[PDB]
Ligand binder design. Structure first.
Ligand SMILES: [Zn+2]
Ligand SMILES: [Zn+2]
Ligand SMILES: [Zn+2]
Lengths: 70, 37, 247, 34, 101, 50, 427, 114
């Protein structure tokens, strides 16, 4: 809820692009995070193992988004 | 406080994609080996 | 298709032809049937008139006093039913006059109905009682066409002439009716054709060569008079609108 | 002449070229035999 | 006669008989009666102006408009009395069935 | 309620017939039937077709 | 041109120097604003009629439009005229679609993003669903079928010039693994700029957006492919199926896969038919004249479950031998001949030296084989004898016999069908 | 008239011969002439097998079921020990595969004390 209002205020200031909404989406911590995975493997178990590893990495990102959001 | 473009792009890439030994580019001992990463 | 009938639509390449089962519609380019209007007896139909302004609708006049209008675009679906109290119809013409109320500084007559929120109807289906936005009974064939970028409100005038007596009846907006009594009832001259000059200006041509002119011009040029015509129609509708919900 | 087969009524299509300022209209003559 | 089956129907029929009735009085009659009043008032103004603007010898009497004005005004006062009245009915309605249950 | 609404509806038809029709008819002019073709053809009975 | 004609006079009128740079700049800014306004007014005829001749000024228009109001005005006007003119049911549906895709490519070139295309598509699709024959003609246009198959079961005329034009527009195409990870992953973030996307540059996806579900599209694609495979694949359809397969897999409901699974099976069915026939000819010395197709019944939607007509004895014996070998090669499987399905190339040799080669169905070949005279005797057969010999109902036989009469092979005299052996008219 | 036949393009439909709304796999519920959810092409890519209990399954459906520890090597429809019917040419190519899985599951049941 706060992210929607804050993005509107930022657009009121300068806007002229969709940069601010995207960076909030990258940096927000209370919403599901969009992830990119390589997974240069074909076996299902290996793909699941890599996806879980990346989920743990994204969990680290969510934890440390405090410095950015402040 | 400028909202630069290319700077945002570089910090974006460093933000995304874990890289490291995993992906592409004795139990406590394994726990410590992971914990370092 | 060989027939002495058929009137071509001025705005689209479509004609209205007459066949035994009813009024029929065939595209000019393809000769392909488009719509069928079920009519019982041809002799009852005094005449049929197309829509000059838009061409999406079509008008049918009955001798007994009923006017029925069907849209071509909906596969000939009936869209509205009209009645005129105790009138024998000889030949009727349908005209649509678009009003242009350009903003003028000297006009301080602001509108507040637009400001007040629009009403809603109450309609109950079998499952539960539902509530829908309010639409006027004749608004479906009068609503602002999705087609018309110039969505200016269009005055709807139906002009009716009575046989055997040359009485002139003018019908506005589908609800209000005005009767005009002609002085020249000495001769029972059949009315040959109706010609429209511009919006609200008509010339009537009888068999004896006499020409009768009906002019809507003074009414169209008076902004208040048209508003008077619109107001009296609304008041009658809303009274029945409450009465419909009371029952 | 526009004729519907050899056993139906014949109706006249009088394409009267009334040159009114270079333009002309069209007429159709119905058949109602006297 | 009553049983459990009709009791729930009795409550369901009664609640819609009052709570839906007040809705149609407030959401329909009041906005409509105000709109009737605004239109007849505009109806009266137009006729009065042309009685002076034309200065035509024959005049159309305005008692027909005035009767409609008071009658429509009488309605709006009369509908508001019912809406308050159905308000009291709902209170009496609910207290009856909570004991009848 | 039914009596009051019908009282207004019946009275509403009276205002339309008594006053509105009187005003609309005054602003509506119907030109008297006239013969135009007599000037060109004064010694012929005229029959009009379309 | 305007400056050379009036600027010196205007400068004299004002009295300002001829080299007033900022006045000329403002005059130019007004000229392009007037150019924009005129183009917005005329955008309908610009995109519908003059395209692609007016393509160049569309690209120039792209250089000018900068505000969202400009885009919302350009679309709301363009819808208004298009719906005014094209969305008339009195307009032929084939030309309506031809003009429609002409606007789609015109606006796609004008707008690379395609958001305006999405707005147009959302606004227009119900009118497409209003018209009935749109699905059949568009998919037939997608697959580029010959006009003969169009005219067999479609009862309204279709403009061949409109057909050829839309095929040309449809075929218009003007619109290690560790090394890519360093390059591409980094490169995608080297250059970056800020209801789902639904704005893909593919026009064929926009065409698919007509259907509420692509299920009917793939089902009819299945039906047409089965009809062609039974008739005989052209390379043109391999591109079509490739475009279909590429888009659905990217998106990934249950029945969508149901009509997406076995499309590869009839491809496998024909591929296995091509391979198995070669094996059968090598082992048992089969007649190399017969090319059987082994199809799997469930996926051709062919309802095996009035057609008990007798094939010629020689052909039936040869076809039965194929079934026996198939049971030997694939244990546990039985093979059933689809007698209503199949094409036979027959050569008819007349006594006057005429040779007629025609592709006929198994039913038509059975009828004409009854008139094969080994002893050169003229065979005259009545309808009742043909029905008994071939076990075919008389009404169906009359249609089959009418086909041969139309081809000039059989002549009907006094209720008996005889062969035309001598034609007294130049072939 | 002489009719000479130059080329014949005949169409044949193949179906499974089952030694007799019930031509469906007891496990996946798909048609015998259809494919199981794990296979894409019919026939050789998704063959049928017949057990001694006369229950018919896709080869992958019953093999996966028998590979579950809860099956105990029993038929899903009759709970008898699943053995392929001998003498059916449809089962000949799958005899060794199913004997191994049933034997392996029997040995595991012996090891688990049940
Ligand atoms: Zn199965
Ligand atoms: Zn399988
Ligand atoms: Zn069993």
């Amino acid at each position: 809820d706060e992210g929607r209002s804050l993005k509107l205020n930022a657009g009121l200031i300068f806007s002229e692009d969709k940069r601010f909404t995207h960076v909030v989406s990258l940096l927000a911590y209370y919403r599901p995070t969009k992830t990119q995975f390589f997974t240069t493997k074909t076996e299902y178990a290996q793909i699941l193992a890599q996806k879980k590893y990346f989920a743990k990495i994204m969990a680290l990102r969510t934890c440390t988004n405090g410095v950015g959001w402040g | 406080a400028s909202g630069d473009l290319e700077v945002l792009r570089r910090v974006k890439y460093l933000h995304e994609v874990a890289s490291g030994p995993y992906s592409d580019l004795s139990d406590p001992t394994a726990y410590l080996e992971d914990k370092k990463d | 298709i060989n027939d002495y009938f058929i009137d071509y639509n001025p705005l689209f390449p479509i004609f209205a032809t007459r066949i035994a089962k009813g009024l029929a519609i065939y595209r000019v380019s393809d000769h392909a049937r488009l719509a069928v209007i079920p009519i019982r007896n041809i002799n009852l139909v005094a005449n049929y008139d197309w829509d000059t302004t838009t061409g999406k609708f079509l008008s049918i006049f009955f001798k007994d006093g009923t006017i029925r209008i069907h849209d071509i675009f909906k596969d000939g679906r009936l869209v509205s039913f009209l009645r005129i109290p105790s009138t024998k119809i000889s030949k009727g013409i349908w005209d649509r006059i678009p009003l242009r109320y350009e903003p003028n500084n000297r006009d301080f007559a602001c509108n507040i109905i637009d400001d007040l929120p629009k009403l809603i109807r109450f309609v109950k289906d079998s499952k539960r009682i539902n509530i829908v936005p309010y639409t006027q009974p004749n608004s479906l064939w009068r609503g602002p066409d999705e087609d018309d970028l110039d969505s200016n409100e269009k005055l709807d005038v139906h002009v009716v002439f009575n046989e055997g007596n040359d009485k002139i009846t003018v019908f506005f907006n589908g609800d209000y009716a005005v009767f005009l009594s002609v002085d020249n009832i000495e001769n029972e001259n059949s009315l040959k054709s109706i010609i429209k000059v511009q919006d609200g200006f008509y010339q009537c041509f009888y068999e004896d060569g006499t020409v009768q002119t009906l002019n809507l011009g003074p009414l169209l040029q008076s902004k208040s008079s048209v508003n008077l015509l619109n107001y009296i129609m609304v008041i009658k509708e809303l009274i029945g609108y409450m009465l419909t919900h009371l029952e | 002449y526009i004729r519907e087969n050899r056993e139906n009524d014949d109706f006249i299509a009088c394409t009267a070229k009334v040159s009114v300022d270079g333009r002309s209209a069209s007429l159709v003559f119905p058949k109602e035999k006297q | 006669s009553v049983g459990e089956k009709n009791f729930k129907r009795w409550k369901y029929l009664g609640c819609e008989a009052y709570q839906k009735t007040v809705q149609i009085l407030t959401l329909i009659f009041v906005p409509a009666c105000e709109r009737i009043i605004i239109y007849v008032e505009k109806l009266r103004a137009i006729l009065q102006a042309f009685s002076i603007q034309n200065k035509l010898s024959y005049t159309s009497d305005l008692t027909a408009v005035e009767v409609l004005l008071k009658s429509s005004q009488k309605l709006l006062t009369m509908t508001l009395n019912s809406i308050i009245g159905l308000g009291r009915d709902e209170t009496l309605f609910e207290k009856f069935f909570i004991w009848f249950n | 309620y039914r009596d009051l609404i019908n009282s207004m509806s019946d009275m509403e038809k009276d205002i339309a017939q008594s006053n509105v029709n009187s005003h609309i008819q005054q602003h509506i002019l119907v030109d008297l039937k006239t013969d135009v073709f007599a000037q060109k053809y004064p010694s012929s009975q005229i029959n009009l077709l379309d | 041109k305007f400056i050379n004609q009036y600027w010196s006079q205007f400068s004299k009128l004002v009295g300002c120097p001829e080299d007033d740079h900022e006045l000329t700049t403002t005059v130019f800014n007004c000229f392009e604003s007037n150019f924009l306004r005129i183009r917005t007014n005329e955008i309908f005829d610009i995109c519908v009629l003059a395209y692609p001749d007016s393509k160049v000024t569309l690209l120039e228009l792209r250089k000018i439009m900068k505000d969202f109001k400009d885009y919302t005005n350009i679309v709301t006007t363009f819808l208004s005229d298009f719906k005014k003119y094209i969305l008339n049911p009195s307009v032929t549906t084939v030309d309506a679609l031809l003009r429609y895709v002409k606007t789609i490519k015109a606006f796609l070139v004008l707008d690379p993003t395609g958001r305006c295309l999405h707005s147009i598509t959302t606004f227009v699709k119900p009118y497409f669903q209003e018209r009935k024959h749109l699905v059949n003609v568009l998919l037939y246009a997608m697959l580029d079928l010959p006009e003969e198959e169009l005219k067999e079961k479609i009862n309204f005329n279709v403009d061949m010039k409109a057909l050829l034009s839309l095929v040309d527009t449809l075929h218009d195409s003007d619109i290690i693994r560790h090394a890519m990870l360093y390059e591409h992953i980094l490169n995608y973030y080297i250059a970056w700029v800020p209801k789902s996307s639904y704005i893909k540059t593919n026009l064929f996806e926009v065409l698919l957006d007509l259907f509420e579900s692509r299920e009917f599209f793939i089902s009819e694609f299945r039906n047409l492919l089965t009809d062609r495979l039974f008739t005989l694949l052209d390379e043109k359809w391999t591109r079509c199926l490739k475009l279909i397969r590429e888009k659905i897999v990217k998106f990934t409901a249950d029945a969508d896969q149901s009509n997406l699974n076995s499309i590869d099976v009839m491809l496998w069915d024909i591929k296995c038919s091509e391979e198995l026939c070669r094996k059968m000819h090598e082992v048992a010395g089969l007649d190399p004249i017969i090319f059987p197709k082994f199809i799997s019944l469930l996926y051709w939607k062919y309802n095996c479950d009035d057609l008990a007509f007798h094939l010629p004895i020689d052909l039936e014996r040869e076809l039965q031998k194929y079934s026996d070998i198939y049971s030997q090669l694939k244990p546990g499987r039985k093979l059933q001949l689809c007698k209503d399905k199949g094409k036979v190339e027959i050569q008819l040799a007349f006594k006057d030296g005429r040779k007629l080669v025609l592709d006929v169905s198994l039913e038509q070949c059975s009828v004409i084989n009854q008139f094969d005279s080994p002893n050169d005797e003229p065979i005259c057969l009545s309808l009742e004898q043909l029905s008994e010999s071939l076990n075919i109902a008389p009404p169906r036989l009359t249609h089959l016999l009418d086909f041969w009469i139309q081809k000039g092979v059989l002549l009907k005299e006094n209720g008996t069908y005889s062969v035309i052996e001598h034609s007294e008219m130049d072939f | 008239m002489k009719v000479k036949i130059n080329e014949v393009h005949s169409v044949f439909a193949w179906s499974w011969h089952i030694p007799s709304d019930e031509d469906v796999c007891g496990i996946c519920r798909a048609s015998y002439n259809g494919t199981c959810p794990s296979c894409k092409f019919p026939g050789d890519q998704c063959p049928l097998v017949i057990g001694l209990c006369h229950h018919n399954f896709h080869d992958h459906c019953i093999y996966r079921w028998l590979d579950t520890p809860t099956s105990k090597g029993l038929c899903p429809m009759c709970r008898q020990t699943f053995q392929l019917q001998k003498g059916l040419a449809i089962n000949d190519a799958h005899v060794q595969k199913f004997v191994e899985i049933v034997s392996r599951r029997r040995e595991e049941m012996i090891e688990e004390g049940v």
